[PDB]
């Protein structure tokens, strides 16, 4: 009958860990107009640094 007894103890027993973010986050929900130009800028830089 929905008693939340012991539930905080269960969730704290193995710890409530952080999602551990990274460098370079995922570009799933970003602006697509920005995303295409970022892809083209990366491809321009990838040859412009290779050719020097």
């Amino acid at each position: 009958n929905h008693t939340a007894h012991n539930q905080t103890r269960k969730a704290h027993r193995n710890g409530i860990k952080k999602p551990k973010t990274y460098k370079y986050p995922s570009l799933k929900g970003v602006d697509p107009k920005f995303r295409r130009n970022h892809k083209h800028a990366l491809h321009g830089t990838a040859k412009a640094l290779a050719a020097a």
Binding site: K10, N14, I16, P19, T21, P25, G29, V30, D31
Partner: protein
């Protein structure tokens, strides 16, 4: 039965503050938002095209996407036994900048102004914060302030 809407039990949480009705003032739009700012989420219930859910009120997130008249924030949320990164899009009226990071940033630009100065001076100086330290051996005075006694009051006329 029961009810779990999108705005349930948000009576006293979405209403405007006293004498703060009307169209929101135009400084809330000119404040720009880059990708990486630590922003609060305090909603105002005037504009509704983009009101957050009742859980994200008051919480603090990080901007990760910027688009037309709206920004995407990232919030860690506790569910069950772990955190989940809820990303969510919000219109710019519900997003105020947080001065917690911007107090730290000016102190970084200040300790870059004292540490790099004194390390070229020749004294390697301290820069960390320190908590409220205990006091020093102080000789108090007694010149006109005589230490005058006290006696606690009885219960007569108190009744």
């Amino acid at each position: 039965g029961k009810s779990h809407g999108y705005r349930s039990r948000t009576r006293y949480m979405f209403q405007r503050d006293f004498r703060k009705h009307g169209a929101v003032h135009l400084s809330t739009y000119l404040k720009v938002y880059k990708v990486g700012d630590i922003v609060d989420i305090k909603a105002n219930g005037s504009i509704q095209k983009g009101m957050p859910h009742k859980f994200y009120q008051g919480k603090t997130g990080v901007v990760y996407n910027v688009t037309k008249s709206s920004v995407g924030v990232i919030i860690n949320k506790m569910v069950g036994n772990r955190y989940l990164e809820k990303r969510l899009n919000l219109r710019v009226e519900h997003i105020k900048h947080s001065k917690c990071r911007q107090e730290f940033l000016e102190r970084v630009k200040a300790n870059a102004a004292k540490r790099a100065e004194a390390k070229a001076q020749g004294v390697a100086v301290q820069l960390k914060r320190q908590p409220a330290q205990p006091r020093e051996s102080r000789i108090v005075s007694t010149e006109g302030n005589v230490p005058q006694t006290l006696a606690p009051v009885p219960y007569e006329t108190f009744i």
